[PDB]
Design an enzyme around this catalytic site. Structure first.
Site, PDB file in Angstrom:
ATOM      1  N   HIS A  40       0.816  -1.206   0.000  1.00  0.00           N
ATOM      2  CA  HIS A  40       0.000   0.000   0.000  1.00  0.00           C
ATOM      3  C   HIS A  40       0.854   1.262   0.000  1.00  0.00           C
ATOM      4  O   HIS A  40       0.315   2.351  -0.206  1.00  0.00           O
ATOM      5  CB  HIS A  40      -1.070  -0.025   1.105  1.00  0.00           C
ATOM      6  CG  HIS A  40      -0.618   0.417   2.445  1.00  0.00           C
ATOM      7  ND1 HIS A  40      -0.312  -0.431   3.483  1.00  0.00           N
ATOM      8  CD2 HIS A  40      -0.508   1.671   2.930  1.00  0.00           C
ATOM      9  CE1 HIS A  40      -0.040   0.290   4.553  1.00  0.00           C
ATOM     10  NE2 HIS A  40      -0.144   1.568   4.242  1.00  0.00           N
ATOM     11  N   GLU A  52      19.410   6.708   8.282  1.00  0.00           N
ATOM     12  CA  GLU A  52      18.753   7.879   8.827  1.00  0.00           C
ATOM     13  C   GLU A  52      18.489   7.767  10.326  1.00  0.00           C
ATOM     14  O   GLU A  52      18.093   6.714  10.834  1.00  0.00           O
ATOM     15  CB  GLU A  52      17.395   8.104   8.150  1.00  0.00           C
ATOM     16  CG  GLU A  52      17.475   8.612   6.717  1.00  0.00           C
ATOM     17  CD  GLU A  52      17.771  10.083   6.617  1.00  0.00           C
ATOM     18  OE1 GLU A  52      18.267  10.643   7.612  1.00  0.00           O
ATOM     19  OE2 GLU A  52      17.502  10.671   5.549  1.00  0.00           O
ATOM     20  N   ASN A  54      17.550  11.530  12.189  1.00  0.00           N
ATOM     21  CA  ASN A  54      16.715  12.693  11.924  1.00  0.00           C
ATOM     22  C   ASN A  54      16.533  12.817  10.408  1.00  0.00           C
ATOM     23  O   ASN A  54      17.501  13.043   9.675  1.00  0.00           O
ATOM     24  CB  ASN A  54      17.367  13.946  12.500  1.00  0.00           C
ATOM     25  CG  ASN A  54      16.429  15.130  12.463  1.00  0.00           C
ATOM     26  OD1 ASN A  54      15.758  15.368  11.471  1.00  0.00           O
ATOM     27  ND2 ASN A  54      16.359  15.863  13.567  1.00  0.00           N
ATOM     28  N   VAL A  57      17.643  16.417   8.832  1.00  0.00           N
ATOM     29  CA  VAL A  57      18.998  16.922   9.026  1.00  0.00           C
ATOM     30  C   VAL A  57      19.968  15.908   8.449  1.00  0.00           C
ATOM     31  O   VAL A  57      19.838  14.721   8.734  1.00  0.00           O
ATOM     32  CB  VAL A  57      19.297  17.157  10.525  1.00  0.00           C
ATOM     33  CG1 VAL A  57      20.739  17.622  10.718  1.00  0.00           C
ATOM     34  CG2 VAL A  57      18.288  18.114  11.140  1.00  0.00           C
ATOM     35  N   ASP A  84      -0.135  -7.555   1.779  1.00  0.00           N
ATOM     36  CA  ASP A  84       0.378  -6.182   1.787  1.00  0.00           C
ATOM     37  C   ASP A  84       1.902  -6.201   1.925  1.00  0.00           C
ATOM     38  O   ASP A  84       2.471  -5.973   2.991  1.00  0.00           O
ATOM     39  CB  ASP A  84      -0.284  -5.368   2.893  1.00  0.00           C
ATOM     40  CG  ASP A  84      -0.007  -3.881   2.795  1.00  0.00           C
ATOM     41  OD1 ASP A  84       0.471  -3.429   1.738  1.00  0.00           O
ATOM     42  OD2 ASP A  84      -0.309  -3.166   3.793  1.00  0.00           O
ATOM     43  N   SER A 172       1.713   1.161  16.511  1.00  0.00           N
ATOM     44  CA  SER A 172       2.158   1.854  15.310  1.00  0.00           C
ATOM     45  C   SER A 172       1.051   2.790  14.821  1.00  0.00           C
ATOM     46  O   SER A 172      -0.067   2.776  15.325  1.00  0.00           O
ATOM     47  CB  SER A 172       2.584   0.851  14.253  1.00  0.00           C
ATOM     48  OG  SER A 172       1.573  -0.027  13.942  1.00  0.00           O
ATOM     49  N   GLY A 175       2.226   6.667   8.814  1.00  0.00           N
ATOM     50  CA  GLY A 175       3.601   7.005   8.549  1.00  0.00           C
ATOM     51  C   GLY A 175       4.606   5.950   8.966  1.00  0.00           C
ATOM     52  O   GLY A 175       5.766   6.006   8.549  1.00  0.00           O
ATOM     53  N   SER A 177       3.815   2.739   8.272  1.00  0.00           N
ATOM     54  CA  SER A 177       3.514   1.675   7.341  1.00  0.00           C
ATOM     55  C   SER A 177       4.716   1.311   6.503  1.00  0.00           C
ATOM     56  O   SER A 177       5.490   2.167   6.081  1.00  0.00           O
ATOM     57  CB  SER A 177       2.363   2.040   6.424  1.00  0.00           C
ATOM     58  OG  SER A 177       1.164   2.005   7.161  1.00  0.00           O
ATOM     59  N   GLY A 178       4.846   0.009   6.255  1.00  0.00           N
ATOM     60  CA  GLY A 178       5.951  -0.526   5.504  1.00  0.00           C
ATOM     61  C   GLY A 178       7.156  -0.898   6.332  1.00  0.00           C
ATOM     62  O   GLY A 178       8.026  -1.621   5.838  1.00  0.00           O
TER      63      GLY A 178
HETATM   64 CA   LIG Z   1      19.304  12.540   8.280  1.00  0.00          CA
END
Ligand SMILES: [Ca+2]
Length: 223
Positions: A40, A52, A54, A57, A84, A172, A175, A177-178
């Site tokens: 989805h 990652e 942040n 930044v 899914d 959860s 945002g 999701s996945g």
């Molecule tokens: Ca970053």
């Protein structure tokens, strides 16, 4: 993630952010060239962001790599969210190190009662909206199939499991999701859906990765 904790930078080294100008979904790195996410979350024009913490930044451990191919599961049903799951091939291999690393696929399905780690950059509120910049984490158990089916009558297939807390408060959310559900060092779930976030008697629902290992391995081997 509602009711979680700040993971700490690069402590979840397999977590990726899918970016189309902005973060829109999580995913998991399963080898140097492939990511698994939720069907989805499909869209064209995906950049995969590794390393990652942040997401607003540049902190120094990021790798930004475009997708070359996306493969939604053959039997994905967008109305029921059955199957899914989606694979994304990177245009070039990621450099793997302690802060950017793959997560192993399971050899067996996890049982109810197993504790897992769920992570993401999704909403942190059950009412209203607040999106964090840094990665959030939640420890939660897999719930019995009977509890899951009683919470969501008529909606749970053999390709789904529930995890979380029937009392609510920790879950959860949009945002996330996945993204990954990791139990005993293996990828057992993908954040898929729920009714709201962190509501009583409405735990999150996750794609059951152990049912897809053959498809994943065959697809990678051929693409
Ligand atoms: Ca970053």
């Amino acid at each position: 993630i509602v009711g979680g904790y700040t993971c700490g930078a690069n402590t979840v080294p397999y977590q990726v952010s899918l970016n189309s100008g902005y973060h829109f979904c999580g995913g998991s790195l399963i080898n140097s060239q492939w990511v698994v996410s939720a069907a989805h979350c499909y869209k064209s024009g995906i950049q995969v962001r590794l390393g990652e913490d942040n997401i607003n930044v540049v902190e120094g451990n990021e790798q930004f790599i475009s997708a070359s191919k996306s493969i939604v599961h053959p039997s994905y049903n967008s109305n029921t969210l059955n199957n899914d799951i989606m694979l994304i091939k990177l245009k070039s291999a990621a450099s793997l190190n302690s802060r950017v690393a793959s997560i192993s696929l399971p050899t067996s399905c996890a049982s109810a009662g197993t504790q897992c780690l769920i992570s993401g950059w999704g909403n942190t509120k059950s009412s209203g909206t607040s999106y964090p910049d840094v990665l959030k984490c939640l420890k939660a158990p897999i719930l019995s199939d009977s509890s899951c089916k009683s919470a969501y009558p008529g909606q749970i297939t053999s390709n789904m499991f529930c995890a979380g807390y029937l009392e609510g408060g920790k879950d959860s959310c949009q945002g996330d999701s996945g993204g990954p559900v990791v139990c005993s060092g293996k990828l057992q779930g993908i954040v898929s859906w729920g009714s709201g976030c962190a509501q009583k008697n409405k735990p999150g629902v996750y794609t059951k990765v152990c049912n897809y290992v053959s498809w994943i391995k065959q697809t990678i081997a051929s693409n």
